[PDB]
Design a binder for this molecule. Structure first.
Ligand code: NI
Ligand code: NI
Ligand code: NI
Ligand code: NI
Ligand code: NI
Ligand code: NI
Lengths: 116, 117, 115, 117, 116, 117
C-alpha cells in the first residue's frame, strides 16, 4: 500500500478511519462545549482525509485492468466513496459517516472477491 | 483543492510535481555519486506521491457526474495517470516521468474544457 | 523546489495556496454555520502554512546573491510576504488574503525577470 | 486512536504496517538493483515509523491503569515492541520484521482480552 | 531522536512544545473571538501531538533496559506524561498544560542523570 | 512558533536538528554499509528540512522591523543559514553540518540580545 510495491493491502485501513469519523460525529451530539465541538471538527477532518487516501490507493495501486473489466462499476464506486467521505468531512450527521462506510463495504466486498 | 470546498483547483499543481520527477530522473543520469543518487531517489518518491495526491483530488473533488458522463474515458484516464506516476517512482528513466506528464496533459485539456461549459 | 536541487520552481505554487486562502475567507462570509466556520478556519490555516513554505523556498533555494544585489529590497519583500500570510491566518477578511496575493505578485514579477 | 477520544482502536493498524515492513524486507532479497534497494529502504523506514506511532498510541491512549495492573508486563512489552521496530528499520533481514510482528501479536492478545471486558 | 540512531536527544523538544500548549491555553482566556478560539484549538492540538511524539521517542529510543532497572517508575511516568498531554489537548485550562510540563520536568531530571 | 501567535520561540529547535544532521554525517563516515548509508541519507534529509523550517519561522514570525533595522545583516544571515542547511543536505561531510551550526549560533546570539540579554 506504500507503492514499492509491497504487496500488502486491506480495506480495513480505510474502514477503521471511516469508523472513527462516524464515532466522532456521534460524540458531537453528546457534549455541546464549543472547544470539544471544535476538536471533534479538527479530528474528523484529519481522519476523513486519511480514509480518502486509503481508498484512492486501493483504486490506483491494488486494482488492475482485469478488475475494472470484471467490475465495470468499480471506477464510479470509488469516486462515489471519496465523495461520500468529503460529505462526511462537511457534516456532523453520523448518517454521512455511515454512508461512507456503506460505500467502503462495497469496495471491500469486491476486494476480497479478487483475493480468491 | 482543500475539500472545504474552496473552489480553487488547477492541474498545474500535479504538473509541477510531475515536472520535478522527470527533472530528477534526468539529473540521475548526470552524476553517479551514490549519495546524490540516494537523495534523488528520496526526493523523486516524495514529489511523485504529491503528484498522485493532486491528480486524485482533481478526480474526486473537482470532477462531478456531468463530467464523467461527458468524458466517459476520464475515470480510466485518471487511473492510468496514477499508475504512470507509480511507474515513475519505480524508475530512473525520464521516459517514465514523461509518460506521467503526457497523461496529466490529457487531464488538463479536459479540465479547462469543463471550466468553459 | 525540493532541494535536490531539481531546477523546477514556480511562484504559482505559493500563489495557488494564497488564492485558496482568500477563497476560503470569501466562503466564510456566505455561510455562518459554526461547523463550516470551523472547517474553513482549519483549512485556511493549512493552506496559508503551505503558502509560507513555498515563499520561503523561493527565497532560500531559488534566489541567489546576484539577485539580492540587483534587488536589494527582495529580502524585506519576502519577509513582508510571510508576515502578510500570517495576518491572513489570523483573519476572516478577504482583504488580508488579497494583500498576501499582492505581495506574491511582486515576488512573481521579480522571479520572472531573473529569467 | 485520534485522541479526541473517538473510542476506536485496533492493533490491526500497527500490524498491517509491520506486515508491510516484513514484506519489504523479503522483496529486498529478490532484486539487487540499487535504485530498488534504495526505494525499499525509504519505504521501510516510513512504514516502520507509522507502526511505532500506532503501537505508542495503543499504549498511551487505549491502555489504562487497570490494564497495567492486570498485565504488569505490558509496559515493558510495548517498549520491547518499539525497539523491535527500530531494529527492523535498521535491517534488511525479514526475521527482524517478524520479531516485531510477534511482539505486536502479544499486544493484540492483551488488547482483545481487555475488550472482552 | 530520528532512529538512525543519531545519538542526539534532549527533553527540551518535548518541553518547548508543552510550553507552547500552556501559552496557547493562557491566550485563550484573553480573546473570546470564535475564529481565534478555533485557531488556538487547532494549534494546541498540533503542538500537543508533537510533544507526545517527543516524549514517546525518549522512552522508546533513548531510554534502555539499565534505565528501566534503575528507575522502575519510569515506564509509568512516561505513560502518565502522555495521558497528561492528552488531557491538555482536551482543555483550555492552563493548569492542564502545566501538569504536562511538571511531568516532563521529572523525565528531564532522569534524562540528565543518565547522561552523566 | 506556531503562528497563533503563541509567543514561544527558541533557536534550540533549529540547533538540535542541525546537531542531529552533523551527527548523522559523522556516523556515515564510520559505516559504509549501503543500507545504513541510505537510511542516514533519508534521515539527514528530514532533519535538515526541519531545521530549515525552524530558522525560517524565527525570521518571519519572531523577528520584526526594529530588529531588521538594528541588525541590518540579519536578513542575509538567515538566507545564508538556509543555504548552509541545503548544502548539508547535499553532503556527507560533518563540516557542512558544523557550518550550519555556526550560522545558527549567530542567529541565536542576536535572538537572545533581542530578548533583552
Ligand atoms: Ni505498500
Ligand atoms: Ni481547496
Ligand atoms: Ni525541487
Ligand atoms: Ni481516535
Ligand atoms: Ni535522531
Ligand atoms: Ni508558536
Amino acid at each position: 500500500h506504500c507503492d514499492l510495491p509491497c504487496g500488502v493491502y486491506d480495506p480495513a485501513q480505510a474502514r477503521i478511519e471511516a469508523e472513527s469519523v462516524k464515532a466522532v460525529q456521534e460524540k458531537m451530539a453528546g457534549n455541546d462545549d464549543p472547544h470539544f465541538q471544535t476538536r471533534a471538527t479538527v479530528i474528523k477532518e484529519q481522519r476523513a482525509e486519511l480514509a480518502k487516501h486509503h481508498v484512492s490507493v486501493l483504486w490506483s495501486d491494488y486494482f488492475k485492468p482485469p478488475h475494472f473489466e470484471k467490475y465495470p462499476e468499480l471506477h464510479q464506486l470509488v469516486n462515489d466513496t471519496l465523495k461520500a467521505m468529503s460529505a462526511a468531512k462537511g457534516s456532523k450527521d453520523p448518517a454521512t459517516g455511515q454512508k461512507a462506510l456503506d460505500y467502503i463495504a462495497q469496495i471491500d466486498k469486491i476486494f476480497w472477491e479478487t483475493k480468491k
